[PDB]
Amino acid sequence: SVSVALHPLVILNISDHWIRMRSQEGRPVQVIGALIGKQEGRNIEVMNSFELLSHTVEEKIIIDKEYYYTKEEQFKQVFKELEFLGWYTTGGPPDPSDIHVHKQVCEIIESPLFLKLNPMTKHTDLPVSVFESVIDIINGEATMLFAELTYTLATEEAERIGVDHVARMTSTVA
């Protein structure tokens, strides 16, 4: 069980991706992306996030791996220290489609995380939920399930100032 730290920039990236796709296509649509960051020992820290390209065949989502590797080389050109960590999507509780996509993603990295945002929520809590994949044996068959992890918010001074400026949006002691 790892301990995950989240950055508000990732949440802003996911929300902007959802808003852009919904406005462009005219109706709300689930988005699928990727996360990058840094892992120290057993502590994971998710820093940034880039969109991913996928297709729908029959009723299943297939992730374009060639585009993923192209974008991986592109971001490795700039952010040398950052590494692939997992994927994200928008929705409610995990569904078998998320299981299929996680099985697809696991071929890239051994133990990816799964972040899910809920854009249509009613409660007063942040709808970000972080899961990890756990393999299990049931009736002699090998399945996988999601175990939720508790996440925090990373502390960066410039990030805090920027998020504060965005949240407020309009003497010196005062």
Binding site: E110, S111, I135, E141, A142
Partner: protein, 260 residues
């Protein structure tokens, strides 16, 4: 068709049981060319890799073969046992860390006698003498790789792990207590600590006259900030639990009343 492959596998396993691994590996490599033309081949390859002091590959192979549903439950547990044993005494690295994490996430690992050592290695705990004694008792003789002059690899790795894990409990420690906690002579404890600090494995320094090795300092003002953050985290979690275990009642009524 498969008679030749079966005979090759039988010869390889007989040679492996005869402690003659060179011919067994050669035969396995030769038969791997014809293997793809068509379960026991993976077992033989994992055993061969285990016999060649290549432990991380054997552990990975055993774990990936532990998920085969066409295999009995007992044999799957035995493969998990082999993977755990190869992981614990594998060379230190990032791949070993990922293997330890994968094994820790596995529930079936909780019914083995080496699970305690897996928990202690993954979570950075102190492994005492008796646990390592039982682990060496359950190990097979080819696993115990020792140099001619001595200095068992497993014992040295366990001592390094103990000293690193003791770096996270103590602000500073004397040589006598460090030698009593690693169960080694104090001079050897000083030598190991100095070697470990020199290569950059640890952060700390040694005061020889006082006989004290000092780990990370943990200054005052950053500690104050971290304690403030933890206290506010406690407040937030307590409010969350109160609000989610007892709605209406105090929670929302007092929230509104405070708002009003």
């Amino acid at each position: 068709v498969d008679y030749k492959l079966e005979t090759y596998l039988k010869i390889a396993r007989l040679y492996l049981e005869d402690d003659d691994p060179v011919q067994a590996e050669a035969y396995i490599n030769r038969a791997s060319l014809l293997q793809n033309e068509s379960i026991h081949y993976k077992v033989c390859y994992a055993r061969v890799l285990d016999y060649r002091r290549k432990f991380i590959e054997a552990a990975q192979r055993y774990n990936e073969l532990s998920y085969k549903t066409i295999v009995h439950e007992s044999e799957r547990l035995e493969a998990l046992k082999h993977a755990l044993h190869c992981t614990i005494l594998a060379s230190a690295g990032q791949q070993r860390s990922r293997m330890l994490a994968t094994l820790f996430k596995d529930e079936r690992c909780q019914q083995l006698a080496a699970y305690g050592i897996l928990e202690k290695m993954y979570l950075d705990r102190i492994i005492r003498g008796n646990q390592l004694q039982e682990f060496a008792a359950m190990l097979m003789p080819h696993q115990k790789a020792t140099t001619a002059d001595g200095s068992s690899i497993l014992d040295r790795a366990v001592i390094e792990h103990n000293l690193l894990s003791a770096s996270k409990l103590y602000n500073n420690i004397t040589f006598e207590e460090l030698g009593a906690l690693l169960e080694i002579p104090a001079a050897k404890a000083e030598k190991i600590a100095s070697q470990m600090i020199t290569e950059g494995r640890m952060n700390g320094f040694i005061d020889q006259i006082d006989g004290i090795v000092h780990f990370e300092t943990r200054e005052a003002l950053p500690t104050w900030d971290k304690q403030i953050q933890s206290l506010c985290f406690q407040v937030n979690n307590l409010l969350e639990k109160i609000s989610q275990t007892a709605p209406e009642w105090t929670a929302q009524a007092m929230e509104a009343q405070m708002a009003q």
